[PDB]
Amino acid sequence: QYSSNTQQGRTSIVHLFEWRWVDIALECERYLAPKGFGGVQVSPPNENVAIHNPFRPWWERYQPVSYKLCTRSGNEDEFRNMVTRCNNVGVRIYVDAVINHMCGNAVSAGTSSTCGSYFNPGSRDFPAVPYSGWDFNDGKCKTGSGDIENYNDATQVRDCRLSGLLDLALGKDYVRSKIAEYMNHLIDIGVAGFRIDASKHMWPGDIKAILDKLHNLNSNWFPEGSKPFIYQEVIDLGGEPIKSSDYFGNGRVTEWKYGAKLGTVIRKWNGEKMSYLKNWGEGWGFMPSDRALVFVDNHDNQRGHGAGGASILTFWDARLYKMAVGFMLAHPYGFTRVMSSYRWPRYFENGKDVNDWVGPPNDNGVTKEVTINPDTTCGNDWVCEHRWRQIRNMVNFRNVVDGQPFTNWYDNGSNQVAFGRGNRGFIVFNNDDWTFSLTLQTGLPAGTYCDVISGDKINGNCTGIKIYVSDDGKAHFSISNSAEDPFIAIHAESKL
Ligand SMILES: [Ca+2]
Ligand SMILES: [Cl-]
């Protein structure tokens, strides 16, 4: 469960949040493959409630109605097509598995679902599965409301309803089997692994019992004996009786401390500066690198949900965001996931984004295709961060330096830092309010290197800054504090 199962030389997953399957399939072929992306996390591919008040929010996808592969992202033929086409060019698909629960208990019975399946929350009836009242934790939960009231009580966090979401009885073999049946459907199609939604809300042992029933990965694409990559969503910033480490048996876990801390550092909030990153990783109290799934922002916390609060950096704070993502992708700690977002009409009112619920760009609820502009950005309000040159090139920097040790660290005692990854790459950051102008040891072979942040290597030349490493490995760097991207990255494959 710990191996990503990406092709060799590919080291990151991108969350193509709310994208349609036909658009992901094409994106695999025209961009993700040639740019060395390891894989794609997809939005939940199983039928959900169509919530019309408010109008088709992103979070309707976290309220299952069945395990039919029938969503606003597309139907089962399209899902299958996407997975095949992506695997065929060496790009993996990881599914957002929503397995803790079905829909909200107070949602109306009917066929308001992405595939038209009938369901009845009040009578606990999901006949497209099928599930009935026997399959939920109503009699196990010991709270008065039946919902989770107190996170200091680990038992109720598992057995009671998360904000009224009907809590599946994952202690029962029948439920475990229906869920395993769904995941095996996906595995056999070609899926390489899963993001396990709401993992904190499930017993580690129950997740174990589900994983036990799963196939090895599809043997046309994966070496026989391959197990799905598993990364479990657990928000653990400390102080709770439930801990990220409690889930290590099943796979990797999301390290939400990562982006929260990094956001604070890059904003220079709370007395924090980049020189303190010399011991980034377990030195900052994070989980082991070999279990961490790390990220600057995710789909929840980029809009003030889950955890991290105000320190979280997003495409909205583009300049600082690029630096944060670049530091992530250069640093050996964790397995890296890059967000890819859509622009929504963000509007604050006494501190809240009242449009934090808004779903993807749409025409009367039909998700818009992803168009690609002339300059290779996206239209139709798709932000496509993974296509920003500064991010895309840092995704390849992580590939090129894969396995190399953190070395040649430099800092000025403030916010001017640099470090290398063995002899394959070097990166330099200026987050101070004055210029960074200094000759530094890079660890690299002598040569002329393109800066992959300001530009690209194209057949014998560079479209941006050029860095000149001398025979002793030293090279001069000059980054103004008013630079739009106040960092520079070079590596073995950016060398002329
Ligand atoms: Ca639960
Ligand atoms: Cl997540």
UniProtKB/Swiss-Prot annotation:
Chloride binds at residues 195, 298, 337. The active site is at 197 (nucleophile), 233 (proton donor). Binds 1 Ca(2+) ion per subunit. InterPro entries: A-amylase/branching_C, A-amylase_C, Alpha_amylase, Glyco_hydro_13_cat_dom, Glyco_hydro_b, Glycoside_hydrolase_SF. The modification Deamidated asparagine is found at residues 350, 412, 459. Disulfide bonds join 28-86, 70-115, 141-160, 378-384, 450-462. Pfam families: Alpha-amylase (PF00128), Alpha-amylase_C (PF02806). GO terms for cellular component: extracellular exosome; extracellular space. This is Alpha-amylase 1A. The gene is AMY1A.
